[PDB]
Design a protein around this ligand. Structure first.
Ligand SMILES: [Zn+2]
Length: 257
């Protein structure tokens, strides 16, 4: 099945998911001189105070933190969105070395990792129907550079040991996603897709201009995870990012001058 190896990585994905070569694929590079400020954009509203995290899981590709979405407890609205989107899970993409790991880039600059908070449009009722609509999902992407440690990331780092291999999960309650945001909520936005198969075109991306910093010690622990299952030959979970795709007919908008 797909993955990030030589034989089943991103340049093979199109054979099983032809949308890989579609018109609205992600990630892309953000060319800051071709992006345009849009005064019509509103400030993002992140309301995560009643978030209820439930579990963390290694899915062989990656680790996801899952949240209860059976109600409007942790939502995103405003920004370029119409309506309310509920938080369902977050996960990261990272590299084997600090000079790579992000999926988006800025002026071709790569960051060490990138966090994706995934949300779906509650007009559609459940996540499964959201992924059949052009405005079904919203993903908030945050870059990570290596520097100072991020206190709010430490509880995640500390449970990784227990979901080392594919299929392992651990109870992960009362984690507050607010500890992962940067100081500013200025952003870029563009219509795209999920970045792992099935690659569905259902996403309004909101990529925050300010990165968060993590320590070298924190990122190191993500690289000790495994793509394989328990009792199989060890393959470290590193470089699980997809290379930038063609912008094609799309415009990137910025919320800031
Ligand atoms: Zn992602």
């Amino acid at each position: 099945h797909w993955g990030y190896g030589k034989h089943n990585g991103p340049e093979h994905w199109h054979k099983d998911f032809p949308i890989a070569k579609g018109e609205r694929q992600s990630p892309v590079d953000i060319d800051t001189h071709t992006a345009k400020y849009d005064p019509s954009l509103k400030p993002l509203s992140v309301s995560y105070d009643q978030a209820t995290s439930l579990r963390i899981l290694n899915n062989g590709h990656a680790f996801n933190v899952e949240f209860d979405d059976s109600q409007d407890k942790a939502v995103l609205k405003g920004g370029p969105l119409d309506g309310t989107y509920r938080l369902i899970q977050f996960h990261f993409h990272w590299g084997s070395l600090d000079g790579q790991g992000s999926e988006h880039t800025v002026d071709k600059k790569k960051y060490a990792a990138e966090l994706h908070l995934v949300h779906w449009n509650t007009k559609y009722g459940d996540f499964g129907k959201a992924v059949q609509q052009p405005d079904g999902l919203a993903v908030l992407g945050i870059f990570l550079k290596v520097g100072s440690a991020k206190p709010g990331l430490q509880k995640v780092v500390d449970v990784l040991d227990s979901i080392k291999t594919k299929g392992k999960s651990a109870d992960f309650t009362n984690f507050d996603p607010r500890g992962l945001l940067p100081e500013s909520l200025d952003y870029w936005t563009y219509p795209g897709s999920l970045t792992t198969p099935p690659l569905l075109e259902c996403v309004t991306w909101i990529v925050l201009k300010e990165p968060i910093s993590v320590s070298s010690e924190q990122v190191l622990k993500f690289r000790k995870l495994n793509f394989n299952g328990e009792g199989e030959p060890e393959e470290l979970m590193v470089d699980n990012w997809r290379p930038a795709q063609p912008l094609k007919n799309r415009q990137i908008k910025a919320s800031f001058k």
